[PDB]
Write a protein that binds this ligand. Structure first.
Ligand SMILES: [Mn+2]
Ligand SMILES: [Mn+2]
Ligand SMILES: [Mn+2]
Ligand SMILES: [Mn+2]
Lengths: 267, 267
């Protein structure tokens, strides 16, 4: 009755296959999506269409490729035709779908399941309180008339440490990086924005973020998925890596929460 | 014989393998290298040591990563763990190596072979004479005691039109970007610093620099290799894309000039 899927990437067929396999019913059931919905992969259009028709029985979280799509939709970036976003960008429907997308959250918290989902996870460097305020802030900009201006501003790499003093372009850059593109941390809670590899191929000082004990990880389960490289692997208890790289010829993974049962759809 | 090899990203093994395969002999042969000796692969240190030892038998042009390396060495830019430069930087002969690196050219001309090498190529906006001057001008800076000020200055993505009017900070950045970061242009030889994907799967007006008729290409053969996603293919007669992305899953490519024969070393 509660399912958390992981990076769909325009894999509409696979999504609906999994959803049918568990007999998902919008009435009784609820879907958490890790949210790299629209990438490398054919039916990005159908995914967005479907997901949006779920309404309240979907709890989405925005990811790097979702943000990128919005960037191209608003002319901040160029479409890379190999993303296969064109069908969706092309039409009748685009404004409807994309205005909806931008209004979607970056954080999802369920107090009773003691569960937290973000796309990349939660930096050791911040507590839930901070994570909550940072999600609200970026969400506010994304939901605004001036969203194209954020998207453009969001693009940097070079505040690496959270540091409550932080403000302006630096502050939002960091938060966007923490939520939507985080994998490796330096031994302290820093951010590496360049290596995308299985934990034990990573160069010298880089540990995976979840391997650095943090305040949220000691009261809450974390679910996430954008780190395809690690294949939902050597994560400690309470940490669920749902991105098993469906679009890369890997697989789409569903987890039934209440009984912690895994279901798997190949490509 | 004359050999020309593309980006040797710290892939020493492959380089020696490929050089044995042609029985490269520093006595009677000469090696042209494309730049980016030092990026992602495991053995930048050995790559640097070897090529330096070739003296006049080697014929180098600096790439973006060699400059970045320089920048890290001078404490101008932060070191990226992914680059794997530590063994090089920590080496007892680090100073000798890098101080030699600074000294290397950005442009190589041979009149008898009618051949011209630069890391990314030659702007359609440059005639040979200008390309010569700009190369000389940056080399003099790199060569000098005050080179870390330059390395700090190269940073912008733009002035992106050449103009003899250009002076100071703006002049050095353009020419640096033209030699070492160029890929796409506008119908009038203007530099795009943002699309790093292949010509076939790209945005509109932007045509690969070499697609646009220029004074040098009309009179000279051009060898380069920065454009890795170019995958070596789709070039006009007279232009030679040697970067096949060795540190990636790609391969190291060697061209003998007398012969226009290719020898390829997988990674
Ligand atoms: Mn992602
Ligand atoms: Mn993804
Ligand atoms: Mn390179
Ligand atoms: Mn390069």
């Amino acid at each position: 009755a509660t399912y958390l899927i992981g990076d769909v990437h325009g894999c509409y067929d696979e999504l609906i296959a999994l959803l049918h396999k568990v007999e998902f019913t919008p009435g009784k059931d609820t879907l958490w999506l890790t949210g790299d919905l629209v990438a490398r992969g054919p039916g990005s259009l159908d995914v967005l269409r479907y997901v949006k028709s779920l309404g309240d029985s979907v709890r989405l979280v925005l990811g790097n490729h979702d943000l990128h799509l919005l960037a191209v939709f608003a002319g901040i970036s160029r479409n890379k035709p190999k993303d296969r976003l064109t069908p969706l960008l092309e039409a009748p429907d685009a404004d409807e779908l994309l205005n909806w997308l931008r209004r979607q959250p970056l954080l999802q918290i369920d107090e009773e399941k003691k569960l937290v989902m973000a796309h990349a996870g939660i930096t050791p460097q911040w507590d839930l309180q901070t994570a909550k305020e940072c999600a609200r802030d970026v969400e506010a900009v994304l939901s605004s008339d001036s969203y194209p201006f954020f998207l453009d501003a969001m693009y940097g790499d070079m505040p690496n440490n959270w540091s409550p003093e932080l403000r302006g372009l630096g502050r939002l850059r960091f938060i966007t990086n923490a939520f939507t593109r985080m994998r490796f941390c330096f031994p302290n809670g820093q951010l590496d924005m360049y290596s995308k590899e299985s934990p034990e191929e990573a160069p010298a000082p880089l540990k995976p973020w979840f391997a650095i004990p943090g305040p949220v990880a000691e009261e809450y389960s974390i679910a996430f998925g954008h780190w395809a490289s690690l294949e939902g692997k050597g994560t400690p208890e309470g940490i669920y890596a749902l991105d098993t790289g469906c679009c890369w010829g890997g697989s789409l993974t569903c987890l039934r929460w209440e009984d912690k049962q895994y279901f798997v759809q190949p490509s």
